[PDB]
């Protein structure tokens, strides 16, 4: 995986209802991962390794 | 760390619930039970497991409509343990009614 | 004669498992020795033999018994 | 030696180890590393366990070991039992006897810890801070009570002198002396017959059985406590985990020397009278021995394990280094069988098979060895090692009188039923590959590509009996699981046959008036062909108008040369019909059943071999090839395509108008391209006609072609019209994972050229395709393995059942047309005393008989509609099964026998099908929908019709409609047999009024799920509500309210004028009408709309009893029961009023339906149709038979969706094996309202019922649990729970005192025996019977 | 503590399968880490709520192929045991067969 700026729909894995959520998780060359998350009360959160 | 040490350990937070709170009704324990079924269970997957592997507790369930709808594995058994644990705490919860009656 | 299927065999003693034992019993004899077989061998085995010995219906449960205490009695 | 059959694992007495072994030890000097000679006593050396070298000893004097029982200097004299390292094993003698951990922590505290006495307090006076004090009185505190250092002090100050307290296990050894068992568990009694606590009972019950395990064991419980302990021999140690060291520098050296030594100080500072701290110490020291040397000592999850801490555990090395799964599972020395590359051998009669030539002179090398022993041609074995090395003549000589009639096994890998291995006989083949019987392809699941298979030789004469009397391929014809044939021949004799036996117009030969017939000498000599017209010749024919014989006719048939030729094949006189047609695998596998249903066992198999070879014989002379011309392009495809592509055209057309959408443009894509394949696939089929012609013109037909794909698409073998439309023609839709399919498919075919983008577009239906063979095989392989693990301890061990009751056989099928007959289901199984014709007083059987195809033709002959069976579960057998109820035994034909294994070949049957189900019936589109026009429920077959569970609604049209939940029809066939199980909605819409029979069209249904059966009686205006908001907030002329959140029933109005029935709520209620509008009767007033069969993981859940989503709940016996019948504050729906009491009376949260509203009394197994159905709930109300339907028919359900066919007797076991664990409420002898076995309970009822009693314990009602404790239900320790910890199964059966008493298959599998089926219990009645005889 | 039983039993068994089947590459070499996934794994769900309490196996996934889509919580906590089996025994079945072509004496 090349380092940029990636998109996912996520299908409604972990709230399985049918909703999407959509995320940017930046790659970088080397060093941590940033995610971030959308909520089932539509809020955002963010994922650090 | 078994089934009897989790056991004794709501046993014993349901006792403190009910010289706390002072109920004397049985359509009153919801707020409490489920509150001893919330504080009895670990955090640590390790810990949960552990029950597992000791006599006093099964896979199969009572109703099936207490289990959420996942994907994974520790939710499912998490929710059996409270599905085990406030199976034991109605009949618990009974008999500490009794002894709350009579002891005080 | 290569046997086929020992079903002609189950039709004198119908069980298909008492049929591997007495068979066995029968055949231990004359594989040791001090026993002459009453068929004579068409070119094979101890075991075609015993199946046509069954087959033919000449030793059962009875004649194995009446056999064994004739060679206890006689040794 | 004995055999073991039932031995108890009762607890060692000290008397009994005293007289194991007897002698005095000290001063332990056991191993010196330096001299490596027999040294003094000691303990676990060389002067223990007799000599080290088997025959001689080193003592100084009396080496021959005259006397026996004395040990005089260095070495063991008796042995008196056994051989040299079977004999007694030793004694170690402690001044303190500590107790064995097993019963202190029992994971947790379940045996040998209960004394109304805590684990933690027991735990602590264990520990160096605390004791327990005995022999009290007198005081104010008891003996069970806890004390400290200070406690205690103040507790001698007080009572003074004759104070007893002892730090070790001897206070509890007084105290267990002290305490009496009898008046322990009279009290127990007492207190559950007193108290009324819920977890009370549970554990009261524990205690009691417990302590009945105590007295009726007749053993002391203070044996537990170890005193004198027996060691384990030096060699019974395997090699350690890491590398390779010695026996003496083993792991278990190191805790053995230190037990001993703490042993010794102990003694040591017991001679010297050492203080109190210090004796406290060493006894500490020494129950921290012990209890380090038994188990690990964890208490917890044991987060870390100390570096690999040398033999923590005895159980660890019970359990996992020597391996309780010693047996059978790790494959253990396959032993002179090995592999090859499967090859076809083209001869070698059915029970026959090649084998290589330099693997057959090394399988059987022993017995080359014996036999040159034997002829006196080899004198020593290494002349023998030699004459083999030579390889001479005379070696092949004896290699052939070996190999001359010896059998042997073939054994695939795969192995997922009983025929995977197969009994042949070998005969030499040039080479290093394995020839094989042709037809036996479909029983190893398996082509010819390379596969291997092991080659097992029998070693010894039983070996050689087991192989040629069951195991043999001519011994298996039929199925073992459906009743099929399974040996089927794959298109070579087929397409021989089907060549052999096809008719041509104007060929050379005519008008053949032949005796013989012998029609093949005119084909080999000149002028004939085998495929001429029809001509009449003369064929003799038997048949069976005589019973035991046969009736010869004579008559001139018009046929073909084929079919004259193919006659002198058949033996005895076949029916004539049966080859007079066109054969493909349909036909021949038809012949060869009659063949074998006809002329038995002994026929067939020759019929079968000489079929075989004529097929061989002439598909050779046959020589079909596959070329260009064969294959045809339709001449009007093309056009075809461009219709469709013009379709398209339109459809994107429509795509520029803003008409279609998305979705419904790629339905009509589907649809357009699938009518397009349909027309291309006609005109394929209209074009495969006339193209190999012979010279003939001016027909109608014109000359059918005999080209090698329309053959093999005819003959239906091989060729399927599935991939002739994808070789010619066009191929299609593909396969994708995603679900979704391009909007233009491939036009062309494999004729053709294709596109790049065609063929990178066909690979993904490769790619969904190749990922469904690696999945599913270990769930597969699991579901097996946990059917063999409930279902191994059911073996037929009686002769007659002795029944009256059995289940009911019905004839059910699925939706739509006919899937099943009765006439399979009637066959096999033996029927009951009476079958009943419509005409009065007339029977059939006597009593009983074997169901074979007479008494089927004599069943189709006549009029039949139910058939009584002797069947499973009632009359159950004590100790197996008696099994004449399973009658025709599949893959013979003969009675049932004794000894046959029943359950492993259920495993089996339910196994045997695939990796994934292929239900899609088409391609990835398909426009699945749920109801085009209507659901279209109406009768097909002739007959009157009975409505059931229906009522009488009264309706201002003709037609009188229901609002029944469940409603069935029964149909007339031929004496009341239904063979139509339509699903009929709820309340559906009848067309045709209630109490009127008809037969013969007039569609009586027409159902729409959009409507609803809440319709009015009475004509009258609508019930005058209050309309208010917040009830109109439901989901799936408006809704006023809504019983959900709160339609509830109210008065019906019965006049025009005045404003004045029963209204069920479903779930969804929305008001279609308006509060004071005229309507009438059976008009719409609301409507509104509101089990789970079929897949892999369904059959885990009807194998494993699991409790489903939505539960039911019966009803019982009559009582008052209505809407609301006094409904409480909270958690609706209590029924309170029962006339006749039966104080039975059920809380229900109020998630469930509303249950009755119709029959005010009800009856004990009324349906309520609550969704799911639950089957405890059944088998405790109804009773064994709705289970048993429930299960057998959802099973067939499952089966019936891919094709697959199953006999329910496999099924039925299985349920069988689920049925145990049988709760009890009257309480008997030895039982107070607990679950036992169900033959435990049979054998106490008839020891109530026989000599004494009237009737103690009765009433007990059976369970369903499934796969976890019906698999852990084996009351024998040796398969009770073999993947689970040993010492913790030890533990309970030693304390319980329970017997093995031979029930079992896996049982004598992990012990190691002779099981109980086959022959084996042929030796185990001989046994039981020379037994008995002296 | 239960975990370290497994895996020496999986690496006795393996290493007997790699000595029967006597194959010596690193690329037809699977069918023996089959036969270690499908025997050394614990059959009911005493042993598998047993092993994994102890140490050296987690939750996580190194494939996403191996993981299985099923409400059955025993089914999934079997292939756990069996992928995290085969993971911890490649690296450990090459070892052996570095160590494997001079070991008999032959």
Not at chain 2, 86 to 101: G, Q, R, S
Not at chain 4, 477 to 488: D, F, Q, T, Y
């Amino acid at each position: 995986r090349s380092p940029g700026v990636f998109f996912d729909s996520d299908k409604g894995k972990t709230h399985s209802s049918g909703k999407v959520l959509y995320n940017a998780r930046i790659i970088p060359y080397r060093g941590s991962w940033l995610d971030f998350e959308f909520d089932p009360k539509d809020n955002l959160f963010v994922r650090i390794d | 760390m078994t089934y009897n040490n989790v056991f004794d350990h709501a046993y014993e937070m349901l006792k403190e619930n009910i010289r706390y709170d002072d109920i004397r009704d049985t359509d009153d324990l919801h707020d409490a039970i489920h509150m001893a079924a919330d504080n009895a269970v670990p955090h640590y997957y390790a810990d949960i497991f552990s029950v597992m592997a000791s006599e006093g507790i099964d896979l199969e369930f009572e109703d099936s409509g207490l289990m959420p709808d996942t994907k994974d594995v520790i939710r499912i058994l998490q929710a059996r343990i409270y599905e085990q644990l406030t199976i034991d705490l109605w009949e618990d919860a009974e008999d500490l009614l009794n002894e709350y009656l009579e002891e005080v | 004669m290569a046997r086929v299927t020992v079903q002609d065999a189950v039709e004198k003693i119908g069980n298909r498992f008492d049929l591997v034992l007495v068979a066995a019993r029968r055949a231990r004899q004359m594989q040791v020795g001090g026993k002459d077989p009453l068929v004579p061998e068409e070119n094979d085995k101890t075991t075609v033999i015993a199946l046509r010995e069954i087959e033919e219906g000449l030793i059962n449960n009875q004649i194995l018994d009446v056999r064994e205490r004739q060679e206890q009695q006689e040794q | 030696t004995e055999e073991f059959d039932a031995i108890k694992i009762a607890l060692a007495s000290p008397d009994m180890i005293r007289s194991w072994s007897f002698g005095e030890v000290k001063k332990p000097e056991t191993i010196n590393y330096r001299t490596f000679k027999p040294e003094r006593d000691g303990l676990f050396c060389a002067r223990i366990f007799g000599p080290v070298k088997d025959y001689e000893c080193l003592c100084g004097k009396y080496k021959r070991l005259k006397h026996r029982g004395v040990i005089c200097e260095k070495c063991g004299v008796e042995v008196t039992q056994t051989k040299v390292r079977r004999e007694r094993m030793g004694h170690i003698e402690l001044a303190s006897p500590t107790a064995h951990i097993w019963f202190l922590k029992s994971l947790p505290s379940r045996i040998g810890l209960l004394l109304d006495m805590p684990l933690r307090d027991i735990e602590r006076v264990l520990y160096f801070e605390s004791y327990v004090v005995i022999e009290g009185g007198m005081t104010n505190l008891e003996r069970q009570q806890i004390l400290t250092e200070e406690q205690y002090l103040d507790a001698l100050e007080e009572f003074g002198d004759e104070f007893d307290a002892k730090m070790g296990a001897e206070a509890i050894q007084a105290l267990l002396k002290s305490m009496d068992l009898e008046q322990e568990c009279e009290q127990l009694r007492e207190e559950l017959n007193e108290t009324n606590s819920e977890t009370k009972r549970k554990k009261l019950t524990k205690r009691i059985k417990l302590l009945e395990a105590f007295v009726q064991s007749g053993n002391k419980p203070e044996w537990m406590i170890l005193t004198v302990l027996p060691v384990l021999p030096p060699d019974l140690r395997p090699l350690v985990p890491l590398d390779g060291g010695r026996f003496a520098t083993s792991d278990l050296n190191d805790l053995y020397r230190r037990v001993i030594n703490r042993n010794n100080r102990l003694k040591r500072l017991l001679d010297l009278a050492a203080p109190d701290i210090i004796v406290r110490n060493e006894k500490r020291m020494l129950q921290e021995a012990v209890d380090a040397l038994l188990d690990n000592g964890r208490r917890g999850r044991a987060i870390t394990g100390s570096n690999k801490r040398p033999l923590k555990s005895l159980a660890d090395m019970i359990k996992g280094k020597q391996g309780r799964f010693r047996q059978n599972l790790l494959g253990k020395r396959v032993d002179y069988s090995g592999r090859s590359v499967i090859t076809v051998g083209p001869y070698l009669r059915l029970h026959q098979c090649g084998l290589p030539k330099k693997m057959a002179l090394e399988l059987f090398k022993p017995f080359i060895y014996g036999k040159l022993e034997l002829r006196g041609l080899a004198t020593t074995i290494k002349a023998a090692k030699k004459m083999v090395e030579r390889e001479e003549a005379v070696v092949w000589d004896i290699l052939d009188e070996v190999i001359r009639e010896h059998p042997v096994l073939l054994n695939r890998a795969p192995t997922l039923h009983r025929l995977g291995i197969q009994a042949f006989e070998p005969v030499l083949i040039e080479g290093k590959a394995i020839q094989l019987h042709p037809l036996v392809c479909a029983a190893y699941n398996a082509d010819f590509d390379g596969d291997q298979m092991a080659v097992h030789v029998p070693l010894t004469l039983e070996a050689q009996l087991e192989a040629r009397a069951l195991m043999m391929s001519t011994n298996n014809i039929l199925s073992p699981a459906n009743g099929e044939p399974i040996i089927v021949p794959s298109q070579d004799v087929v397409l021989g046959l089907y060549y052999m036996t096809r008719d041509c117009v104007n060929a050379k030969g005519e008008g053949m008036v032949l005796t013989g017939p012998k029609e093949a000498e005119r084909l080999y000599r000149s002028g004939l062909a085998s495929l001429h017209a029809r001509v009449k010749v003369r064929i003799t024919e038997y048949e069976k108008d005589a019973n035991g014989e046969l009736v010869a006719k004579t008559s001139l048939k018009d046929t073909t040369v084929g079919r004259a030729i193919l006659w002198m094949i058949v033996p005895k006189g076949l029916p004539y019909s049966i080859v007079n047609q066109a054969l493909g695998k349909k036909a021949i596998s038809k012949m060869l059943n009659t063949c074998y249903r006809i002329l038995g066992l002994k026929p067939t198999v020759i019929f079968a071999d000489q079929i075989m070879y004529t097929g061989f014989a002439y598909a050779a002379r046959s020589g079909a090839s596959v070329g260009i011309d064969d294959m045809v392009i339709p001449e009007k495809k093309h056009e075809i395509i461009s219709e469709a592509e013009a379709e398209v055209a339109e459809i994107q057309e429509q795509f520029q108008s803003g008409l279609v959408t998305a979705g419904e443009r790629y339905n009509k894509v589907i649809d357009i391209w699938a009518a397009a394949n349909d027309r291309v696939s006609k005109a394929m089929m209209d074009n495969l006609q006339t193209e190999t012609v012979i010279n003939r013109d001016g027909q109608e037909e014109k000359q059918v072609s005999f080209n090698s794909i329309y053959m093999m698409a005819d003959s239906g073998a091989r060729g399927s019209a599935a991939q002739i439309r994808q070789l010619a023609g066009m191929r299609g839709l593909m396969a994708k994972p995603d679900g979704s399919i391009i909007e233009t498919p491939i036009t062309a075919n494999f004729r053709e050229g294709l596109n790049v983008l065609q063929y990178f577009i066909s690979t993904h239906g490769a790619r969904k395709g190749l990922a469904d063979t690696a999945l599913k095989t270990a769930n597969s392989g699991y579901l097996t393995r946990r059917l063999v693990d409930v279902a191994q301890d059911l073996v037929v061990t009686e002769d007659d059942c002795g029944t009256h009751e059995g289940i009911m056989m019905t004839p059910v099928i699925e939706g739509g047309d006919v899937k099943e007959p009765l006439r399979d289901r009637v066959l096999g199984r033996v029927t009951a005393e009476d079958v009943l014709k419509p005409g009065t007083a007339d029977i059939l059987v006597p009593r009983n008989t074997l169901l074979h195809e007479q008494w089927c033709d004599l069943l189709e002959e006549n009029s039949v509609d139910a058939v009584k069976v002797r069947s499973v579960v009632s009359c159950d057998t004590d100790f197996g099964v008696c099994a004449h109820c399973y009658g025709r035994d599949l893959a013979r034909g003969h009675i049932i026998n004794k000894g046959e294994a029943i359950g492993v070949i259920a495993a089996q049957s339910i196994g045997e099908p695939g990796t994934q189900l292929t239900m899609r019936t088409f391609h990835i589109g398909g426009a699945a929908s749920r109801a085009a026009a209507e659901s279209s429920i109406q009768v097909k077959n002739k007959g009157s019709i009975k409505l059931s569970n229906v009522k009488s609604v009264v309706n201002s049209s003709g037609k009188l409609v229901i609002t029944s939940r469940n409603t069935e029809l029964k149909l007339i066939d031929e004496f009341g047999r239904t063979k139509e199980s339509y699903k009929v909605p709820y309340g559906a819409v009848l067309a045709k009024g209630d109490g009127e029979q008809v037969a013969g069209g007039e569609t009586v249904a027409n159902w729409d799920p959009h409507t609803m059966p809440v319709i009015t009686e009475v004509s009258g205006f609508v019930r005058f509500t209050d309309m208010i908001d917040g009830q109109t907030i439901t989901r799936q002329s408006l809704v006023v309210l809504d019983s959900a959140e709160r339609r509830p029933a109210l008065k019906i109005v019965d006049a025009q004028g005045n404003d004045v029935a029963q209204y069920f709520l479903p779930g969804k209620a929305i008001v279609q009408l308006e509060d004071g509008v005229q309507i009438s009767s059976g008009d719409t007033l609301a409507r509104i709309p509101q089990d789970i069969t079929g897949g892999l993981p369904r059959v885990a859940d009807l194998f494993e009893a699991r409790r489903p989503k939505e539960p039911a709940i019966l009803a019982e016996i009559s009582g008052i029961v209505s809407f609301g019948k006094e409904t409480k504050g909270k958690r609706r729906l209590v029924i309170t009023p029962v006339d006749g009491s039966d104080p039975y009376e059920e809380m229900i949260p109020k998630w469930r339906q509303l249950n009755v509203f119709e029959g005010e009394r009800v009856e004990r197994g009324d349906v309520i149709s609550d969704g799911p159905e639950a089957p405890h709930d059944i088998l405790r109300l109804r009773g064994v038979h709705a289970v048993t339907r429930y299960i057998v028919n959802e099973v067939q359900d499952v089966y019936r969706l891919q094709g697959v066919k199953i006999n329910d007797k496999h099924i039925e076991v299985i349920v069988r094996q689920m049925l145990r664990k049988a709760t009890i409420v009257n309480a008997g002898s030895s039982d107070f309202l607990e679950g036992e076995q169900v033959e435990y309970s049979r054998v106490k009822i008839a020891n109530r019922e026989l000599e004494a009693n009237g009737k103690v314990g009765a009433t007990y009602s059976r369970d369903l649990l499934g796969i976890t404790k019906a698999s852990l239900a084996t009351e024998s320790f040796i398969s009770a729970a073999s993947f689970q910890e040993t010492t913790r199964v030890l533990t309970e059966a030693a304390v319980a005192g329970k017997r093995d008493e031979l029930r079992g298959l896996k049982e004598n599998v992990i012990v190691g025996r002779l099981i109980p089926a086959g022959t084996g219990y042929a030796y185990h009645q001989d046994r039981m019977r020379r037994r008995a005889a002296g």
